[PDB]
PDB file of C-alpha atoms in Angstrom:
ATOM      1  CA  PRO A   2     -13.720  17.633   9.761  1.00  0.00           C
ATOM      2  CA  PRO A   3     -14.504  20.847   7.930  1.00  0.00           C
ATOM      3  CA  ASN A   4     -12.204  20.214   4.997  1.00  0.00           C
ATOM      4  CA  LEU A   5      -9.701  17.515   5.988  1.00  0.00           C
ATOM      5  CA  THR A   6      -6.864  19.869   4.976  1.00  0.00           C
ATOM      6  CA  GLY A   7      -3.739  19.927   7.149  1.00  0.00           C
ATOM      7  CA  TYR A   8      -0.870  18.111   8.800  1.00  0.00           C
ATOM      8  CA  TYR A   9      -1.439  15.543  11.492  1.00  0.00           C
ATOM      9  CA  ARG A  10       1.299  14.496  14.039  1.00  0.00           C
ATOM     10  CA  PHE A  11       1.497  10.847  15.159  1.00  0.00           C
ATOM     11  CA  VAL A  12      -0.009  10.075  18.593  1.00  0.00           C
ATOM     12  CA  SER A  13      -0.652   6.276  19.218  1.00  0.00           C
ATOM     13  CA  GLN A  14      -1.204   2.960  17.416  1.00  0.00           C
ATOM     14  CA  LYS A  15      -1.898  -0.804  18.008  1.00  0.00           C
ATOM     15  CA  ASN A  16      -1.633  -4.105  15.966  1.00  0.00           C
ATOM     16  CA  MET A  17       0.429  -2.840  13.157  1.00  0.00           C
ATOM     17  CA  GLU A  18       1.972  -6.356  13.058  1.00  0.00           C
ATOM     18  CA  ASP A  19      -1.142  -8.092  12.314  1.00  0.00           C
ATOM     19  CA  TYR A  20      -2.002  -5.893   9.513  1.00  0.00           C
ATOM     20  CA  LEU A  21       1.361  -6.111   7.736  1.00  0.00           C
ATOM     21  CA  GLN A  22       1.353  -9.654   8.199  1.00  0.00           C
ATOM     22  CA  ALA A  23      -1.916 -10.150   6.454  1.00  0.00           C
ATOM     23  CA  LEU A  24      -0.463  -8.272   3.396  1.00  0.00           C
ATOM     24  CA  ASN A  25       2.568 -10.900   3.725  1.00  0.00           C
ATOM     25  CA  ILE A  26       5.304  -8.373   4.292  1.00  0.00           C
ATOM     26  CA  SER A  27       8.730  -9.654   5.217  1.00  0.00           C
ATOM     27  CA  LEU A  28       9.986  -9.741   8.912  1.00  0.00           C
ATOM     28  CA  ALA A  29      13.072  -7.438   8.229  1.00  0.00           C
ATOM     29  CA  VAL A  30      10.598  -4.808   7.136  1.00  0.00           C
ATOM     30  CA  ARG A  31       7.779  -5.321   9.495  1.00  0.00           C
ATOM     31  CA  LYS A  32       9.800  -4.643  12.748  1.00  0.00           C
ATOM     32  CA  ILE A  33      11.250  -1.525  11.360  1.00  0.00           C
ATOM     33  CA  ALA A  34       7.596  -0.306  10.926  1.00  0.00           C
ATOM     34  CA  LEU A  35       6.727  -1.050  14.571  1.00  0.00           C
ATOM     35  CA  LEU A  36       9.121   1.535  15.623  1.00  0.00           C
ATOM     36  CA  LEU A  37       7.996   4.253  13.213  1.00  0.00           C
ATOM     37  CA  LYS A  38       6.019   7.452  13.993  1.00  0.00           C
ATOM     38  CA  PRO A  39       4.394   8.341  10.765  1.00  0.00           C
ATOM     39  CA  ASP A  40       2.489  11.623  10.168  1.00  0.00           C
ATOM     40  CA  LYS A  41      -0.409  12.443   7.761  1.00  0.00           C
ATOM     41  CA  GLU A  42      -0.384  15.316   5.538  1.00  0.00           C
ATOM     42  CA  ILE A  43      -3.585  16.115   3.493  1.00  0.00           C
ATOM     43  CA  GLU A  44      -4.706  18.439   0.747  1.00  0.00           C
ATOM     44  CA  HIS A  45      -8.354  18.842  -0.105  1.00  0.00           C
ATOM     45  CA  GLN A  46     -10.039  20.741  -2.779  1.00  0.00           C
ATOM     46  CA  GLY A  47     -13.748  19.943  -2.945  1.00  0.00           C
ATOM     47  CA  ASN A  48     -14.129  16.452  -4.259  1.00  0.00           C
ATOM     48  CA  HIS A  49     -10.277  15.714  -4.937  1.00  0.00           C
ATOM     49  CA  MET A  50      -7.791  14.840  -2.357  1.00  0.00           C
ATOM     50  CA  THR A  51      -3.886  14.127  -2.090  1.00  0.00           C
ATOM     51  CA  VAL A  52      -3.204  12.098   0.991  1.00  0.00           C
ATOM     52  CA  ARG A  53       0.596  11.516   1.945  1.00  0.00           C
ATOM     53  CA  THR A  54       1.975   9.185   4.637  1.00  0.00           C
ATOM     54  CA  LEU A  55       5.468  10.478   5.941  1.00  0.00           C
ATOM     55  CA  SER A  56       8.064   8.503   7.992  1.00  0.00           C
ATOM     56  CA  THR A  57      11.778   8.009   8.347  1.00  0.00           C
ATOM     57  CA  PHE A  58      11.766   4.792   6.271  1.00  0.00           C
ATOM     58  CA  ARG A  59       9.985   5.787   3.118  1.00  0.00           C
ATOM     59  CA  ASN A  60       6.852   7.925   2.438  1.00  0.00           C
ATOM     60  CA  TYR A  61       3.896   7.025   0.540  1.00  0.00           C
ATOM     61  CA  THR A  62       1.516   9.012  -1.652  1.00  0.00           C
ATOM     62  CA  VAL A  63      -1.860   8.675  -3.440  1.00  0.00           C
ATOM     63  CA  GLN A  64      -4.418  11.021  -5.505  1.00  0.00           C
ATOM     64  CA  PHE A  65      -7.969  10.648  -6.031  1.00  0.00           C
ATOM     65  CA  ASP A  66     -11.383  11.879  -6.871  1.00  0.00           C
ATOM     66  CA  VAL A  67     -13.951  10.677  -4.084  1.00  0.00           C
ATOM     67  CA  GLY A  68     -16.616   8.539  -5.660  1.00  0.00           C
ATOM     68  CA  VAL A  69     -14.688   7.640  -8.821  1.00  0.00           C
ATOM     69  CA  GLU A  70     -12.936   4.255  -9.044  1.00  0.00           C
ATOM     70  CA  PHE A  71      -9.290   4.294  -9.775  1.00  0.00           C
ATOM     71  CA  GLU A  72      -6.316   1.931 -10.120  1.00  0.00           C
ATOM     72  CA  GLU A  73      -3.942   2.527  -7.101  1.00  0.00           C
ATOM     73  CA  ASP A  74      -0.291   1.792  -7.288  1.00  0.00           C
ATOM     74  CA  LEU A  75       0.866  -0.044  -4.074  1.00  0.00           C
ATOM     75  CA  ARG A  76       4.375  -1.393  -5.032  1.00  0.00           C
ATOM     76  CA  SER A  77       5.846   0.730  -2.702  1.00  0.00           C
ATOM     77  CA  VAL A  78       3.828  -0.890  -0.056  1.00  0.00           C
ATOM     78  CA  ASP A  79       3.280  -4.524  -0.657  1.00  0.00           C
ATOM     79  CA  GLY A  80       4.072  -4.843  -4.369  1.00  0.00           C
ATOM     80  CA  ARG A  81       0.355  -5.097  -5.467  1.00  0.00           C
ATOM     81  CA  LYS A  82      -2.191  -2.942  -7.339  1.00  0.00           C
ATOM     82  CA  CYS A  83      -5.902  -2.239  -6.550  1.00  0.00           C
ATOM     83  CA  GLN A  84      -9.033  -0.752  -8.107  1.00  0.00           C
ATOM     84  CA  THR A  85      -9.711   1.658  -5.110  1.00  0.00           C
ATOM     85  CA  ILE A  86     -13.006   3.678  -4.585  1.00  0.00           C
ATOM     86  CA  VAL A  87     -13.533   6.254  -1.755  1.00  0.00           C
ATOM     87  CA  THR A  88     -16.726   7.640  -0.312  1.00  0.00           C
ATOM     88  CA  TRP A  89     -18.083   9.783   2.395  1.00  0.00           C
ATOM     89  CA  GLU A  90     -20.936   8.194   4.487  1.00  0.00           C
ATOM     90  CA  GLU A  91     -22.126   8.095   8.032  1.00  0.00           C
ATOM     91  CA  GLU A  92     -19.903  11.166   8.400  1.00  0.00           C
ATOM     92  CA  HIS A  93     -16.547   9.574   7.861  1.00  0.00           C
ATOM     93  CA  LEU A  94     -14.347   8.602   4.899  1.00  0.00           C
ATOM     94  CA  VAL A  95     -14.478   4.932   3.613  1.00  0.00           C
ATOM     95  CA  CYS A  96     -12.099   3.206   1.160  1.00  0.00           C
ATOM     96  CA  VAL A  97     -12.311  -0.371  -0.239  1.00  0.00           C
ATOM     97  CA  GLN A  98      -9.198  -1.538  -2.196  1.00  0.00           C
ATOM     98  CA  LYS A  99     -10.654  -4.321  -4.377  1.00  0.00           C
ATOM     99  CA  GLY A 100      -7.896  -6.821  -5.606  1.00  0.00           C
ATOM    100  CA  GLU A 101      -6.219 -10.038  -4.607  1.00  0.00           C
ATOM    101  CA  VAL A 102      -6.544  -9.636  -0.702  1.00  0.00           C
ATOM    102  CA  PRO A 103     -10.092  -9.731   0.793  1.00  0.00           C
ATOM    103  CA  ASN A 104     -11.404  -6.998   3.199  1.00  0.00           C
ATOM    104  CA  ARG A 105      -8.622  -4.556   2.070  1.00  0.00           C
ATOM    105  CA  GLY A 106      -9.256  -1.076   2.628  1.00  0.00           C
ATOM    106  CA  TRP A 107      -9.387   1.664   5.470  1.00  0.00           C
ATOM    107  CA  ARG A 108     -11.480   4.250   7.526  1.00  0.00           C
ATOM    108  CA  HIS A 109     -10.798   7.813   8.583  1.00  0.00           C
ATOM    109  CA  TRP A 110     -12.915  10.055  10.753  1.00  0.00           C
ATOM    110  CA  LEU A 111     -12.505  13.184  13.045  1.00  0.00           C
ATOM    111  CA  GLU A 112     -13.461  14.567  16.384  1.00  0.00           C
ATOM    112  CA  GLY A 113     -11.756  17.578  18.100  1.00  0.00           C
ATOM    113  CA  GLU A 114      -8.147  17.877  16.734  1.00  0.00           C
ATOM    114  CA  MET A 115      -7.973  14.170  16.585  1.00  0.00           C
ATOM    115  CA  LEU A 116      -7.390  12.136  13.223  1.00  0.00           C
ATOM    116  CA  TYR A 117      -8.609   8.571  13.586  1.00  0.00           C
ATOM    117  CA  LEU A 118      -7.625   5.803  11.176  1.00  0.00           C
ATOM    118  CA  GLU A 119      -8.613   2.095  10.872  1.00  0.00           C
ATOM    119  CA  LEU A 120      -6.676  -0.417   8.499  1.00  0.00           C
ATOM    120  CA  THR A 121      -8.072  -3.693   7.270  1.00  0.00           C
ATOM    121  CA  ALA A 122      -6.783  -6.707   5.503  1.00  0.00           C
ATOM    122  CA  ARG A 123      -8.119 -10.182   5.475  1.00  0.00           C
ATOM    123  CA  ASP A 124      -9.127 -10.669   9.140  1.00  0.00           C
ATOM    124  CA  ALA A 125      -6.379  -8.356  10.440  1.00  0.00           C
ATOM    125  CA  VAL A 126      -7.557  -4.958  12.048  1.00  0.00           C
ATOM    126  CA  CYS A 127      -5.191  -2.125  12.756  1.00  0.00           C
ATOM    127  CA  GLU A 128      -5.703   1.262  14.708  1.00  0.00           C
ATOM    128  CA  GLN A 129      -3.711   4.515  14.577  1.00  0.00           C
ATOM    129  CA  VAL A 130      -4.317   8.098  15.916  1.00  0.00           C
ATOM    130  CA  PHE A 131      -2.928  11.470  14.829  1.00  0.00           C
ATOM    131  CA  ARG A 132      -3.173  15.037  16.132  1.00  0.00           C
ATOM    132  CA  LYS A 133      -3.831  18.012  13.521  1.00  0.00           C
ATOM    133  CA  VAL A 134      -1.205  20.660  13.942  1.00  0.00           C
ATOM    134  CA  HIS A 135      -1.464  22.695  10.557  1.00  0.00           C
TER     135      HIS A 135
END
C-alpha cells in the first residue's frame, strides 16, 4: 500500500452472516446483505482518511485522523455509536471500535492489487477481498 488511495472492486467474501448476527441485525436485512457485492473507495492525505463503503442497498461513509480517537456514528449500520481509534502497525491498518459490543473492529492490508479486510464482533470473524481498479 503506497498511499491507500483508490477504488477497489468486490472479489469475494465469507461468513458475513456470522458477523451481522453478532451485531444483532434483523433477518430481513441480513439476507439482503449476503447477496450484495460492495466496493471500497478511499481518499488518503497523509494522516487523514475518508473510507466509503458502496452497494445497491445503502452506502456507508466514515472520516478520521489515524492515531486520534473519535466518536463514530454507526446508526446507518446497527444503530450504535463507538469511540474508534485507528493505527498503522505490523504493516497494516488496525481499528478497534470501543463500545457496547466486545471485540468490535476491523483490519485492512495489501499485497499486489489486492485489498484484504477482516471484520470482528464478539466471537464472530468475517473475511472480504477487493481488487484495486482506480
